[model samples]
Target chain A: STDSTPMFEYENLEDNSKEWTSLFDNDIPVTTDD
Target chain B: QRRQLTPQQQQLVNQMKVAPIPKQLLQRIPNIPPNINTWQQVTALAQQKLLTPQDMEAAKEVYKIHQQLLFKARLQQQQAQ
Candidate 1:
């Protein structure tokens, strides 16, 4: 619940709206070393 | 602190240490982190309507790292004891 709200907006909506969001947000932000 | 790693605790602790997010979970669900720490958290989340059925499915499939392992360890510990 604590985690659901903030991500619920940007994580799913925009991410699914653009897979590039996933590629950039998680893959780049978290896996920036790659 | 009453936290002590008994032999069994260490056993599950090691399993948790080596765990990772599953391919199914990653591909299947949204960008949920592996930080959820317990079913109590899950339950609370559900009651609050912050979690959906997909989240429950993820939990069942061991999607979250800390929560899943601790959940397994705790459930088994209860049964074993």
Candidate 2:
């Protein structure tokens, strides 16, 4: 559930909300789905 | 104060952990830089902007590079093998 927390906050709050924090912060999600 | 929740909002929070979040889907087209030799590039593209800080930190738990091209190649090799 490590990813779930940020997903929860991002899902719950608005973009303007301070609560809407980045799970990656400045970094990007490591993707390999292509 | 937080705005009042709508039926849509309620559904979103409840389904926060579910698969196939249509709204949450990213529209970004993948653009891996041609040269990925330094860690700086990793932080620049894959780390600093693309991933959230928490996600970046989480990625450190596994894999060595900021990008996992090695893993991708390994997977390809496995299939070919």
Best by lDDT: 1
lDDT by residue (tens digit), candidate 2, A1-34: 3553435332343454221223223433385242
> lDDT tens string, model 2, B15-59?
322222111111221233523433334445454355555544443
| Candidate of highest DockQ | 2
> lDDT by residue for model 1 over A1-34, one digit each (tens)?
3554444331132222232212112321343232
lDDT of 1 by residue, B1-81 (tens): 345455743565345434555454445446644344433332444455555766655554453344345555555745533
Per-candidate DockQ versus the true complex?
Answer: 0.02, 0.11
Off by over 4 Å in 1: A1-34, B1-5, B14-20, B31-49, B63-81
Rate residue B81 of model 1 by lDDT: 39
